[PDB]
Every structure is written in C-alpha cells, then in structure tokens.
Amino acid sequence: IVEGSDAEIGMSPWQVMLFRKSPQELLCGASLISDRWVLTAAHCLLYPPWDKNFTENDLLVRIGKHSRTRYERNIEKISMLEKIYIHPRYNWRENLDRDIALMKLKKPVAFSDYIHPVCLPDRETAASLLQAGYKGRVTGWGNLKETGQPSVLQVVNLPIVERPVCKDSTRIRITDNMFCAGYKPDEGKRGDACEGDSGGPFVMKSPFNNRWYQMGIVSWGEGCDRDGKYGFYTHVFRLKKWIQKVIDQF
C-alpha cells in the first residue's frame, strides 16, 4: 500500500496473506468469506506471462495477522488448501477480465477477535454503494512505493471513479466486470495498492446495516500511485453467481 497508514489491531479480521511455502514469501492478499473459503484474485495463482502457476500443495493461507514478517504465535492461524478454483473465463491473455479465485481450506478456521469473515454483497448493497465518489478501503502488506515493505498491515481509503474517467486513463480495454478506484491528480490526496497487495479486499461499510462488504478484489494497475492512473478491481457482485455456484456445488 502506497501512501496509506498502519491498520489498527483487529481492523480487518477478514484479511488474509498468501504465503509461498518455498521460498517462504508473500505472494498476494486475500479475504476470508466463511470458515472454509478464502477469496482472492486469479492472477495470484495463475499468470502464464510471468511463469506463475501454483497448486494447492504450493502455498499456505495465513489468517489473523497484523505483522508482515513475524510468526504471530497464539493469534494467527496458518491453513492448508484443499482445492483452488479459478474462474473458467479468466482472461489472462488480454485484460485480466474475471480476475477471481476461490480457495477451500482443508479444515475450517475458528474465528476470534482477529479472525472474522467479511460479507459478500447482495444486488441492493451493490446498487446503492458502488457509486463514483464513494470511498472504499484497501488493505495489505504490499510495497509502500512503486520502486520498502511495511512492518504491519497498511490501510488506505480510496474513492470510486467514474467509468468514463477509468477508460480514458488506460489503453487496456476495460470490461463491466472491473471498476477502478483512486484519487485524481487535482484532488490533492494520493494512495494506491502495489505489488503484494493484489488479491486483497476492497471493502465498504454499509450505512444501512453497519456491516462491511467486499465490493472488489485488487486486480491490476499500471505502476503504483501514478498521477492520472488508477487501480482496477474485480467487480465482486457481478461474479457472485459463480461464487455461490462453486460453494454450493463443491
């Protein structure tokens, strides 16, 4: 996270860390949606261009963390994955359309003061909250600048941006399944995700029921916190059907 600030203890109980077995390293962020399902971006598990193609036996899911590097004894819980599911229509060759994946833990994790699931949105909550100018919040242990690592989970609040504005800032063809967020060069405030943050949750707190909903997944950006550029997120609600499907079926 670029231009963010230290998260408060227990601020994002749903935050997860995608940890590589060997070499032991931070791969991506993710989010806990139930006691046996973790939600992340697909490009975290598969991206041929960068010779990335991990399997269940390749990584660990660490939940309940605050510190990036420390093994937080008695607080965090490390899980093994039973099955990874990538969206059957993830366009990694072109624009990362449908950058989403589900991971099923081997054994349920127990909630605590530091481990708690985030809500998935329903049509209404998405209809009402996903509006340009409305701020969301992103979290992660990713790099603090495009080109170093924070000590503890970072957080930054960003506003959602007008679709036309997003389109005109990139050459990449954006789809309905994505939305971009960020500040404009004039607004005089900055902030953005960055390497190691991707796969993380972009949440919003419902002013109606006081709950937190994940409205997006950090998907892709062109650099980090660049003026006139914005971070793109996977439109979670737009792909909810596939989520339910995978969960119910499997």
Binding site: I9, P13, D113, V118, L129, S206, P207
Partner: peptide, 28 residues
C-alpha cells in the same frame, strides 16, 4: 455468514476505527 462483516473489536463493542468516518461521510 450470520455475523459477517461485524468486527469483534469494533462493531460488536460499538467502537469506531480511526478512519471509518471518512468512508461514511462519502456516502451521500
């Protein structure tokens, strides 16, 4: 989940976090 999105150390205790007001004030 039944109590999804409700944070044990904040909502369940009715305490707010350092910056959540920012989000809320953006929701016109």
């Amino acid at each position: 989940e039944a109590d999804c999105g409700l944070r044990p150390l904040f909502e369940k205790k009715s305490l707010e976090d350092k910056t959540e007001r920012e989000l809320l004030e953006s929701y016109i």
